[PDB]
Amino acid sequence: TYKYVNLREPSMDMKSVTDRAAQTLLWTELIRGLGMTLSYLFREPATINYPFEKGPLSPRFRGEHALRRY
């Protein structure tokens, strides 16, 4: 199965045409993009406070070598 990512025909009824004219002149879809970055401004950042905080690791981590004893 396949799908088309970009094969759609815009409608030509006066309401749709005006909706697009308002988009072109009032920058509505650019304003919308500003909303997304604004929402991120008020999200808690993902930063950890290295070296006081450390990224998570697992027992399998492969780091510095060492020779062991019985």
Binding site: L41, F42, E44, P45
Partner: protein, 70 residues
């Protein structure tokens, strides 16, 4: 958190407030407590120059009232 951006904004705000406050207060200090006289047109300069002679102290901002007409 986003409110940790506020301290830098406040510092920026205080610095940008200073020039306006300083200009306004230096104008009062230098013009006998009043606003600096504005002379966009020759008539306004003429009157200001006349005030300099009238002052008797060579300052266009030293005003003379009724007490100067006998």
């Amino acid at each position: 958190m986003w409110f940790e951006v506020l301290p830098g904004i406040a510092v920026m705000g205080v610095c940008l407030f200073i020039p306006g406050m300083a200009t306004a207060r230096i104008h009062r200090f230098s013009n006998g407590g009043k606003e600096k006289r504005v002379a966009h047109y020759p008539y306004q300069w003429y009157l200001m120059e006349r005030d300099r002679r009238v002052s008797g102290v060579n300052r266009s901002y030293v005003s003379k009232g009724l007490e100067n007409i006998d």
